[PDB]
Write the structure tokens for this entry.
Amino acid sequence: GPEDTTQDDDMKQSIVKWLFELNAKQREVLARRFGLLGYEAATLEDVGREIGLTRERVRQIQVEGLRRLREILQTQGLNIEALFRE
């Protein structure tokens, strides 16, 4: 239907809109820890280095994001659980 209309691991594309909502971090942090949107799923250390930030930044910003991230998805009939549903 809306922005997403591809509810898979590709649903990360709708989370790409989350970048224009809260910041680019919430876009990249999920994708980098899950390996979505052509990103590479790595450890907190590896993913942190990839963006030039601390391990916490990728992990924990993602972790806190998981709560808010539902808001944009639920309004579109999308589920955040699909991002980690591998």
Observations:
- The chain has one domain: 1-86.
- The CA atoms of residues 12 and 34 lie 10 Å apart.
